[PDB]
Design a protein around this ligand. Sequence first.
Ligand SMILES: N[C@@H]1CCCN(C(=O)CCC(F)(F)F)C1
Length: 152
Amino acid sequence: APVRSLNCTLRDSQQKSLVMSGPYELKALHLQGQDMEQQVVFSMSFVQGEESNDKIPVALGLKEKNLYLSCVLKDDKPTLQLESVDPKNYPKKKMEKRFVFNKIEINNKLEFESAQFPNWYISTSQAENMPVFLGGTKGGQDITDFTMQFVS
Ligand SMILES: N[C@@H]1CCCN(C(=O)CCC(F)(F)F)C1
């Protein structure tokens, strides 16, 4: 059948919102009131991959954009990028592994682990207006926990 998808927003565990601020640029900042319209709306697709009760493979596309978060090596490091795709072919159920995140639910928070790079996670900095990135631990000073808000 078709791939199933939900519209949503994400906030980090400091309640920082995610916004587009430049070509293929994604930043986290504290937002409230009118400025909240700036936040990115995702289409979260439920994709093929290894799955358990609390670990669900997803892709994260920008709503009605042919842009997906993906994990690739850049200058020999696992990195997070926005990647353009052919809009005729996406989303699909069998997303390529660079696009797949394991959405993990622990203690009412979500983590998004790269399926391609085990124990690398979508991460934000504690500082305001810094890039969203792929970080090589769910430990330390950077933030690896999120909440989802469902969008109409
Ligand atoms: N100043 C930085 C240079 C590296 C890439 N940057 C991103 O914002 C990537 C965001 C995400 F989510 F795609 F990873 C900007």
